[model samples]
Target chain A: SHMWIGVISLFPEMFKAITEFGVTGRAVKHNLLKVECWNPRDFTFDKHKTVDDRPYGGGPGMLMMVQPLRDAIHTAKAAAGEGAKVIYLSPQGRKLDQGGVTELAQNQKLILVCGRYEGIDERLIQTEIDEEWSIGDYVLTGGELPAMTLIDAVARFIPGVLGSFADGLLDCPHYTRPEVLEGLTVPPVLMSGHHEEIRKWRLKQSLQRTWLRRPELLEGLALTDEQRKLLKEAQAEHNS
Target chain B: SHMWIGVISLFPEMFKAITEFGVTGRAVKHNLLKVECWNPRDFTFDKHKTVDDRPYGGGPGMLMMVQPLRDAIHTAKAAAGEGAKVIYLSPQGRKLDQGGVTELAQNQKLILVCGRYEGIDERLIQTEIDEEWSIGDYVLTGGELPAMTLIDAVARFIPGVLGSFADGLLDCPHYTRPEVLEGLTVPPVLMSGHHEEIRKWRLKQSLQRTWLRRPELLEGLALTDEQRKLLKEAQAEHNS
Candidate 1:
């Protein structure tokens, strides 16, 4: 199934990176997905084509004007069709997670509004936006990167986007040729040519890696008996 | 003080978006910071210019060759000088937050290694990387966007990057001219011209917005007595 994505941003050129390279580029090339950028600059009626202005009271930075943003968002939504969710990327939004990506990937269309300057006028957000998402806690120069990040992450969950590698699990460690590089050997288990053992080893490493690096991920997971046994063995190996 | 940054990636051209736009661009234009990209392909000694290969045992995707990556890291480190910290962007890395960005902004130099394929060979990470950072819990097509995100976030903390707005806080809502839009009036306080009341109102809104949207962020923050009173009012206002 294909998905349609619309992005509203002042610097739409920044999106060329995603549309011209890697997985997203491939997705676009193959027609498995479509992405279009709507610039607020195009929607402005002023001769100066201003999209931002000084804050009402006082502030360090300009605030994006509501008219251009609201018009641009409406255009994006119209292009995306009905039932499309409008997401505003902001620092005040909920932190994005794997589950959120999966949920968004299932949607047929998405309209992403990328804010610049201080932020868009609040009234526009209250009236037009369906949801808000932040990639992380840190601030950025603008929301273009966050919108791109969301597209790339969510696209991975789309069928055929990842080809046969879409069975979501933390990827296991990988090793290439050169049995010994600077005296560090590839794991013996990976080279044993035992298919069952290799699968078990990868599973164990995935579980243990998540445990050691991101224990919060394991909190909601339910492991099977074999996975439980592998995890125990991995624990013993690490401790030893 | 200024800083130097080096990036190791296959798609070096992707860095142009950051180096040429918005605040990060302004910083680079003024020489507040310098960025250089080193391609692992450039470090390859083979005719094919191979940087990745099939996994040792078996896998759905290829793994980045350790030698090229290691060489690239060394070259970046050399260019960035002795105190440069090597960071690998990975799903298994620690989640980057505002505090992390602030801490990194103070560094003299940073060498960010952007991985592709399944990931860089584990041995390369074990041997050369000083740290690993994941922008969030989700996966991305590659590390280029994360690198840009980090650069933009960290640049905001540089002395002159944000100019007068260098003080970090969740920015309060902002409104421009045409105070009444689609039946929504600009908050009366913002246009009242009472400086003290406006400051207090902005603070209260910032506090309330953070508390409502990201309660976890509030856990780490130390609230002043005035802030506490504002938060209480915010909660009461919210409940009512």
Candidate 2:
């Protein structure tokens, strides 16, 4: 890979927090990820450098102008190189998920265009974008958070990005030093001396969680018989 | 009205950029909306305030501790008072949209919880949460962005909260002072002397956009005959 990512946006400063914190921040520090911002205004043809205009028809808000956005995309793509995919963050695009993140992470680079005002110019997306990804079904005032969200989700798929290899596996069930505090105690199995028994319990819990919390994920999931049995057992336990 | 916004997570600051933005920032500043952050860690009684636990069985990651999450939710409920809906932000929650935002904005209070680690304690959602809202089908490291997305979408529906009385309408079509720049020109109707024609043209564009960009939004919308005629014309023009 192309782990390099570029964002074209008006509020480049809004991204500082993402590049400075948590897993995403680490990706930047390790050089596992590279992020740069391209302001469309900087590419504008006017002294005022305005990058938006009213939509052609009567409407609610302004639409981003086509030329500056086109110029910004061109610059980002040139910098990202041949393998980069240009993604526009829009509510009208495909819903993003873990699978989508994994799919995009495999790319060598990504150029994310974050639109402001009403929406982006249709011509820009038609001519410049390779894909569109929406954070959810709802709308936002802009695309900054959606871009950051994509970065965080996609970075996890990078090998060794989350140190303590076990942290990745044990992440689903880890409780810290104190097993219990106040009236709550670690599930007895977590502290049990029997390793195999602990394994059984953990599997059951994970299956139950995935089933109850995200049943949709189970639709096409490839689950082993052991996992299926554990899910059934967990369901029985909950019922009783 | 109450907006049930739930965020379940270990890191609260991941969402600060939301309450600090344009329309969203103003909404918070005026108290037109209510927001709360629930950290499962706060429910921990341990010296380290741990919120995640190792898997009960063999697995790749740890699971968020169940009890603390439950306790935190209980606390969140008490904080929300009566008629408060508790929502869990997750990939599996109900898909959100503009209609969803409108419905949620009608709520008097919403309790949002952010989940971190591999995922939250699923059982808590089964027994406690009123519903789930997914930004999309995508998986995120946490629910902070989804929570903020929900807030921003719903915030606009709060009466008089949006700065522009015309913002709900005008925001989609606003053009600044400059009618043209370079070789690009403003749509003649927008600058034409005839106001009625301009209004009709803008409506057509909005309809065209909604149809072209979000055809799904038109599924159950009740449109007048004139609106339907305009849509047909726009579609014909689009196809032609």
Candidate 3:
């Protein structure tokens, strides 16, 4: 199985960092992922090849015009098919989370629109975009980075993309090599070779870590009976 | 007027996208930003130059050993400074937002630790990392993308880095070129050449857009009386 991800950006070359570097690159090499870039400039026929212009009502910088982006989306749609979901990466979009990424990974195709740092015409956004997703609340120079981030995160949840297998709880502390290094040892239980005890230690540690660092994560999360009992034990252990 | 940002990563070349392209790249050219990478592999003296080993508790994938990362951070601190902030990019970190970026931008020197996809030894995190910052709740293959995202976002706020200057609201929509295209005309106020009226329109639009799309952003944000008044009017206009 494979997925096709298309991007519309001014700097397509920036994506080489993602496509040639690691997990995503490996995915491409094996035919598991295919990423194509559509530069907004490619759709413009102006002598200057201008894709941006001054805002309609006085702003600090230029905004990407609708013509090129609209045309680019149309072309991308042709390749991705009319039914492909087109997402615009921006701070205003829905905040992306692990759950959201998992939902997105189910898609066989996606088209990401990378708007200019200044802004993009609302007209194109209103007409062409199916979804607007943000990596977080932070503002960024351009949608290029967010687009790349979204692709990378979404790619991870894909089956066989990597060893993704994480559940509701935050991951526990991971350790490797030199069990006793600089006075810090891998929790002795881990090296003791007690498989069942190691599982409990890991679970309790995951619960303890989440409760201490990001307690908000545990709220409303459906926890198993085993999890609840272990969490209580973990909390007790934390206090002791 | 300049800043030095150091990174510790398994794939240092992945950072060229940030240092050689876009706003951050321009910062490098102007001597406004400097990014240097320290690979953990460099610290490893093993035959494989091995930086990763099997987890003590038998996990799905390997975890990065502590030895290499510890050495890498020590070397990076020598270049940055003893007081330099050392940030680790990970999912289980303080959620990074626009405000966080602004705060991080104040530092003249910062070191970022990019851990492996499987995970990094927790001992190093507890011992070396000064802060743990996450771009979002989603996970990725590695911390490289988040490191680049953090750097890009933080650098944008530095003076002379980019035309940052934004208030506590989502930016207003921008439009440019082709006053009339595909039956979509520039909003009448923008083309009317009424500068003051255009200002009010833009401000009101920003208020309205924020209220509709991200009402949560305005919850605790300080707003002027004019913004409150305009927001009501925008709400009325939207309803109509």
- Candidate 1: clashing pairs of residues: none
For all candidates, the clash counts are 0, 65, 0
Q: State the displacement of the C-alpha of residue A87, model 2, in Å, after optimal TM-score superposition.
A: 2.0
Residue-level lDDT tens digits of model 2 in B112-207: 877665666544555677888877666666677677777777777777665311212111234433355444455677666687887667667767
Would candidate 1 be rated incorrect, acceptable, medium or high by CAPRI criteria?
medium
Model 3 CA deviation exceeding 4 Å by range: A163-165, B163-165
Model 1, A92-203: lDDT tens digits are 7878888788888888899999998888888888889999888988889899999999999988877888851122346678888789877899999999989899988888
Using DockQ, give the best candidate's number. 3
Which one is best on TM-score? 3
lDDT of 1: 0.84
* Residue B163 in model 3: lDDT: 65
The TM-score of candidate 3 is 0.95
lDDT of 3 by residue, B1-240 (tens): 478899999899988888888788899888888899999999999898988789887867887767888899899999887568999988778889888998898888999999875778888887888899888888888999999999998888777888612666766767777777667787899888899999888888888878898887788678889988999999998899
lDDT for B91 in candidate 2 is 59
> What is the Å distance of residue B17 in model 2 from its true position?
1.1
Candidate 1 Cα errors over 4 Å, as ranges: A164-170, B164-171
TM-score of chain B of each: 0.94, 0.84, 0.95
Q: What lDDT does the true structure give each of the candidates?
A: 0.84, 0.69, 0.84
Q: Tens-digit lDDT track for model 3 on A1-240? A: 378899998889999988898888888777788899998889999999988778776756887867788888889899997557999988778879888998888889999999875877777777888888888878788998899988888887666778512666678888888777678877889888899999988888888778898888889578889889999998887789
